[PDB]
């Protein structure tokens, strides 16, 4: 006889409407509402499930006068259906209609009604009711959660449609994040900040063993983690300072990788961010504890290794509880500009970028030199342009960036390497953008560079190839530019 | 009054349209065109009165959008059986099918009470039934819809693309509501954050040719305040425009000129007029200025256009451009010219900033150089800066704060004379800055210096003494700050500590 169309909002009705797609914990919640003195209204399968479990419930029909003060409604699993199937008609069937209208209408009437759209909130709601804490502020926070839920549902639908039919660049783009935590401050102490995630990447794969990451720590962790996880199971160590790499090495073991990464620039590593592709043991911990680093992120950390930093107050230690580092692979990238944002496909160093590169020179690089070029390419692509990266025997030996000219950047890189007492003879060089003139090769000959990898594409490419041939260097043109602001 | 939404059903070939819109632009002509195509028209509230008033044959339906408060609007989610034309002739007023749904959406008690419930429910229900009904949420699509119908082009794919627009519209509405609630009650950092953009255009590519790119806007800032007079902006042009525009609009109505190359400033000046400001901005680094981006806080006239045209630049963005100034660049191909059709440059002033990291984003308040940052700074030295030196420090502070850190900015008589950045040390950055200034044949004696990070040792001051720096502005905060103060006192320099850091990655 009664339908949802005959139900209206009324404070003190002590009558709950329970109509859910996700039926998890609905029986116990219905039993707890009944014990609290609520009359229960329900539809379809929810009604049959409640009645079956001895709950006193009255059936109302779906639209496809009685007052209510609790609306417990959740939606058709659209997200789960799109992940599990490509059948478009099945996907359209899992678009909930009616459910969001009920959630949004109850939310707008929060002064008089409680709105529940998440089974994870049932136990909290019951305890609030038992403690006599169902006040206007409690219902206002449920109203905020309700509009976040319906906004997220339709944003997911719109993003999925635009990914399937408009190559991921639709008329309206929704960048939706779920808060992980607030940071102590933003880029500067006078700014507030927070970390947001698209799914569960940070929630599921990061555990703070000591301290709390700052806003700048997180962008530095991202950069160090992306570099140290780019070489499979190899014992990579990445050292980052102010968003740029200042150290990188792969050696026989993690302790040797750390000592050689640190050799490139000890000065900048003081207060840096260290990413370890493997176990942080007691030995590695003491080696790092010779200087004061701000952050250490390891795949897994030993108890004795954590104890080594009991003295340092501002050091932060993170674990992924994994044998090797786990990274995220976002398909799209975005940059804030005043008034909006620019959106694009994520840049990536292709697995066959060096393998498919054109050999331009008389000389071919050796197997060890090709490994060093691979390391140099990846560092250059992850570093903010215009840059030059010098790698020797699995370790970065010099890096230049930020200058108006790379000839000026290279001279600053060589100056730091001389200061560090590093032998650059036999090293390889990578740049993420083409070298415009042969002076780039002539400057490289001074330090005994043996192999070069660059995208190629200059009008003076012929004189660059000739200069490499004069010095007997290996030269590869990838045809892939990796500029990064 | 008589008909209600409970009497309406989605039905293919019903030849009956429901028109109920907040944005009433072009609804009269669209209603007239639907009526000429043989559609019967149903309408509510203000839309009904507007249509009836303009001689359109329309029947009223109780207002479902406006607001005993019922649980949900009486909107049927299913479809009525599709009937043939000969079945309609052979043949009813209690059950009316609809095949076109044209609906679009618009004190704490006032905002909450005005949340539309019936409108989104109607839009979302029609959209799900796209195989049978047309859903219209954008007045910009009315003319296209009429031509599609006249040409017999209304097919399942056409209705599918309308369904996508419908869910973008209802997603945008609830995302704006959730963001407002979190701004009011959770300081703008809610449990779910929605960064929503509307596409302006696709760029030819992204940061690199192998990437696809596009420009998105919040509340139509780029659509309403930017007009391309010549060429098309690339993805990298847009981030360079942003940087040059933000600098040149930081001094109110002053005749600022900003020159940017690869996201960093390579020129800046404020002189008596825009022509003089350009001349003095270019002096700092003529070389990097080649193929750069120029932002003009005012009119680009024939005289200034002719002075810029002496070299090659990729982009010019001015507040307003004279016809004669645009004509100067008729021959060349590579240059791009933009206008804001305004007396002075217009910024958006976004309250929040965000950075992409894999798996998500970091979110924060937007940084800003406060109007009284230098005025409230502590004078640490013997010597106080003059009125002209304080103006130069203000310019140097703002350039340093907008430039990617760690940096050093040298300003003299309203013009930037040197800039150093990028490398691991600010002593290394300063030596590169002095080298470029010597190459440019610029006199640095009497200039001021700014850094938006504290100087850790007196060696920063001793290097500044070589070029005759007279005043320094820094946030302060080092251990040996008293040693940095002693050095500035030995050379007779003015030294200010603002206590505000502006680090920028």
From Swiss-Prot, chain A:
It catalyses: (6R)-10-formyltetrahydrofolate + 5-amino-1-(5-phospho-beta-D-ribosyl)imidazole-4-carboxamide = 5-formamido-1-(5-phospho-D-ribosyl)imidazole-4-carboxamide + (6S)-5,6,7,8-tetrahydrofolate; IMP + H2O = 5-formamido-1-(5-phospho-D-ribosyl)imidazole-4-carboxamide. SMART domains: AICARFT_IMPCHas, MGS. GO terms for cellular component: cytosol. GO terms for biological process: 'de novo' IMP biosynthetic process. Pathway: Purine metabolism; IMP biosynthesis via de novo pathway; 5-formamido-1-(5-phospho-D-ribosyl)imidazole-4-carboxamide from 5-amino-1-(5-phospho-D-ribosyl)imidazole-4-carboxamide (10-formyl THF route): step 1/1; Purine metabolism; IMP biosynthesis via de novo pathway; IMP from 5-formamido-1-(5-phospho-D-ribosyl)imidazole-4-carboxamide: step 1/1. GO terms for molecular function: IMP cyclohydrolase activity; phosphoribosylaminoimidazolecarboxamide formyltransferase activity. Belongs to the PurH family. NCBIfam families: PRK00881.1 (NF002049), purH (TIGR00355). This is Bifunctional purine biosynthesis protein PurH. The gene is purH.
């Amino acid at each position: 006889d009664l339908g949802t169309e005959n139900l209206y909002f009324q404070s003190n009705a002590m009558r709950a409407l329970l109509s859910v797609s996700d039926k998890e914990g609905i029986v116990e919640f219905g039993k707890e509402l009944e014990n609290l003195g609520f009359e229960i209204l329900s539809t379809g399968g929810t009604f049959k499930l409640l009645k079956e479990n001895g709950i006193k419930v009255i059936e109302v029909s779906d639209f496809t006068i009685l007052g209510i003060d609790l609306v417990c409604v959740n939606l058709y699993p659209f997200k789960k259906t799109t992940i599990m199937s490509d059948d478009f008609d099945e996907i359209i069937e899992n678009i909930d209609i009616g459910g969001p209208a009920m959630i949004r209408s109850a939310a707008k009437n929060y002064k008089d009604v409680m709105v529940l759209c998440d089974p994870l909130d049932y136990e909290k709601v019951i305890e609030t009711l038992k403690k006599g804490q169902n006040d206007e502020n409690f219902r206002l926070n449920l109203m905020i959660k309700a509009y976040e839920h319906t906004a997220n549902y339709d944003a997911y639908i719109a993003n999925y449609m635009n990914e399937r039919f408009n190559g991921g660049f639709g008329a309206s783009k929704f960048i939706v994040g779920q808060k992980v935590f607030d940071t102590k401050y933003g880029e500067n102490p006078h700014q507030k900040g927070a970390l947001y995630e698209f799914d569960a990447f940070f929630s599921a794969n990061f555990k703070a063993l000591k301290g709390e990451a700052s806003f700048n720590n997180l962008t530095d962790i991202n950069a160090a983690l992306n570099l140290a996880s780019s070489f499979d199971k190899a014992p990579a160590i990445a050292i980052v300072k102010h968003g740029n790499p200042c150290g990188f090495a792969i050696k026989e073991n993690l302790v040797q990788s750390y000592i050689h990464a640190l050799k490139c620039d000890s000065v900048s590593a003081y207060g840096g961010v260290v990413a370890i592709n493997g176990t942080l043991d007691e030995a590695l911990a003491n080696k790092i504890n010779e200087i004061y680093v701000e952050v250490i992120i390891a795949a897994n950390v030993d108890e004795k290794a954590l104890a080594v930093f009991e003295g340092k107050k501002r050091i932060k230690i993170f674990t992924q509880e994994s044998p090797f580092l786990i990274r995220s692979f976002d398909k799209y990238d975005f940059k804030h500009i005043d008034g909006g944002f620019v959106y694009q496909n994520s840049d990536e160093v292709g697995e066959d970028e060096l393998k498919n590169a054109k050999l331009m020179s008389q000389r071919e690089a050796s197997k060890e030199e090709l490994k060093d070029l691979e390391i140099a390419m990846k560092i250059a692509a992850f570093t903010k342009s215009n840059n030059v990266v010098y790698v020797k025997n699995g370790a970065m030996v010099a890096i230049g960036m930020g200058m108006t000219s790379r000839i000026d950047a290279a001279k600053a890189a060589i100056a730091k390497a001389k200061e560090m007492g590093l032998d650059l003879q036999g090293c390889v060089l990578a740049s993420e953008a083409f070298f415009p003139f042969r002076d780039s090769i002539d400057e490289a000959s001074k330090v005994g560079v043996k192999a070069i990898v660059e995208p190629g594409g200059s009008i003076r490419d012929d004189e660059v190839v000739k200069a490499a041939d004069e010095y007997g260097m290996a030269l590869y043109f990838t045809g892939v530019r990796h500029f990064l602001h």
